[PDB]
Structure 1
Amino acid sequence: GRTLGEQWKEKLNAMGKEEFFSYRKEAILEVDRTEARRARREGNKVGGHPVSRGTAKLRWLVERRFVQPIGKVVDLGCGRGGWSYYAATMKNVQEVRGYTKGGPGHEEPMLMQSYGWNIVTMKSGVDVFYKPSEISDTLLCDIGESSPSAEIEEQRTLRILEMVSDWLSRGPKEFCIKILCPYMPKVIEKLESLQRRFGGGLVRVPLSRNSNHEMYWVSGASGNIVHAVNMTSQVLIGRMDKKIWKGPKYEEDVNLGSGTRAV
């Protein structure tokens, strides 16, 4: 046969617009960004409004001890820097280094003055697939591009998995990696291998939209991957074909404050 996630991806692509858009936000957690937008507009950089939604995503993991940034932090595919700035707010972090592709169709790093910004250093024009690995205490990675093909998503995920190992072999004991397509059998066996060597486990962040099955490979987690995935697949499938769409659960975004920090 084929995996539950496999079937999810097929059932997903067969939905109408009205159904899709309505489904992808059903029962999910969502951050209110409207004030972030206002700040952005006005150019206010010291109101603690994150640069993206991803800040709230990482916060969700961190607060549940799934990952706990420490020492030198490296954020691969940092984009605007939601994850980088958030790591810089934490007392145990001393150095935040981010890398992202930039250019056409890609998010450029964004300057904010959230608490700790001064130890953040983001660099654009960098393709992590050709960037020599560096030492780190914490390794973050949030790379992964959607596609209506699960096979595409598979190989994309596999390329990512292949490359993150090199960064991990450098001894960071705290980590968080986006697995774009975790439900595919080749991805699973690869994670099964990587889990044996590096530990950790896979976790679904409820802030992620129902239109994607992304899970995060995190060092503060553990346990059976194949079960973990399937559970998420039953939830996501369980949300389909709904009667009265209740919509998302709105939460307040994280406040990263302002000002520098001496290290």
Structure 2
Amino acid sequence: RTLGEQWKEKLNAMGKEEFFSYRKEAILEVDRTEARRARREGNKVGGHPVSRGTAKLRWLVERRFVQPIGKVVDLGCGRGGWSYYAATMKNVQEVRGYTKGGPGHEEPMLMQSYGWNIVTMKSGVDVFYKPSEISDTLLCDIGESSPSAEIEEQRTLRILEMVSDWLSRGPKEFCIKILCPYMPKVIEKLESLQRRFGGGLVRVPLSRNSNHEMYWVSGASGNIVHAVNMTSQVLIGRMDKKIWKGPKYEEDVNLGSGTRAV
């Protein structure tokens, strides 16, 4: 069994005290106090992202791992961190988000960030049963953690099934969350999908150590197995610390406000 599987079982044997110290050890982090402490203040235009997801997408975009353009489809948009971030970019003509919403899942929040006007987010949409549509940029950030690697594997495999349908419609810019990249069956489907659609897997340092999520991005390249093992080793390397030095903090993105005519 793989290093990720070993990391996983090791993650689950930890106590609560250690788990909480561990999951944010040496990771990158944005302070959300400002964001959340400007909900009741009734401010749609302070540039405060709706989620931590925006900073994740920025990290990738900044490094040219994906370059949003044209019609953007955002699968499992949730609150809209990714959809609104895309909306601020000048090559983006349209942003269409879909999320399931409902009990125990995020709905699309209203915001008035820069270019919010080209954003349409529909809740009550299970993407597993949404016919695909042509897009230029396909974003997908779906994947529910579970203590069981096997469940995350089945969940990942299921997501990789439908993503493939949307990718077959032409989008050359893409960014797909891979919940459990370290299980063998997942590696096998990913090699096949890479063979066909290109791209690579990238670890975003804003991800917590309690998860192994990697992003399949059009702007990346290289050997998946190796990329995945490198991430597993880093995650294991952060275990068993005597002194927990905590995370390193980053200023959140400023998404501004107003509209744009495209």
Q: Sort the TM-score into its range (normalised by shorter chain).
A: over 0.9
Counterpart secondary structure, 1:146:
coil
CA distance in 1, matches of 2:146, 2:35: 28
Percent identity over the alignment is 100
Deviation at 1:41, TM superposition (A): 2.0
Counterpart secondary structure, 1:202:
strand
Deviation at 1:38, TM superposition (A): 1.5
Counterpart secondary structure, 1:178:
strand
Aligned pair count reads 262
Could you report, residue by residue, the CA deviation over 1:123-175 in whole angstroms, capped at 9, with x for unpaired residues?
00000000000000000000000000000000000000000000000000000
Unpaired stretches in structure 2, ≥5 consecutive residues: none
Deviation at 1:213, TM superposition (A): 0.2
Q: What TM-score results when the alignment is normalised by the length of structure 2?
A: 1.00
CA distance in 2, matches of 1:117, 1:26: 35
1:138-153 mapped onto 2 (5 Å cutoff): 138-153=137-152
Deviation at 1:40, TM superposition (A): 1.3
Could you report, residue by residue, the CA deviation over 1:26-84 in whole angstroms, capped at 9, with x for unpaired residues?
00000011110121121200000000000000000000000000000000000000000
Deviation at 1:243, TM superposition (A): 1.3
CA distance in 2, matches of 1:39, 1:46: 10
Counterpart secondary structure, 2:175:
strand
CA distance in 1, matches of 2:12, 2:111: 38
CA distance in 2, matches of 1:78, 1:112: 14
CA distance in 1, matches of 2:32, 2:215: 23
Could you report, residue by residue, the CA deviation over 1:83-142 in whole angstroms, capped at 9, with x for unpaired residues?
000000000001000000010010000010000000000000000000000000000000
Q: Which residue of structure 2 lines up, in the alignment, with residue 237 of structure 1?
A: 236
Could you report, residue by residue, the CA deviation over 1:165-196 in whole angstroms, capped at 9, with x for unpaired residues?
00000000000000000000000000000000
Moved over 4 A (4+): none
CA distance in 1, matches of 2:171, 2:4: 31
Counterpart secondary structure, 1:96:
strand
1:81 to 2:80 alignment: yes
- RMSD value, Cα: 0.4
Deviation at 1:210, TM superposition (A): 0.2
Unpaired stretches in structure 1, ≥5 consecutive residues: none
Q: What TM-score results when the alignment is normalised by the length of structure 1?
A: 0.99
Q: Which residue of structure 2 lines up, in the alignment, with residue 174 of structure 1?
A: 173
CA distance in 1, matches of 2:42, 2:5: 43
CA distance in 1, matches of 2:56, 2:19: 22
1:193 to 2:184 alignment: no
Counterpart secondary structure, 1:125:
coil
1:12 to 2:5 alignment: no
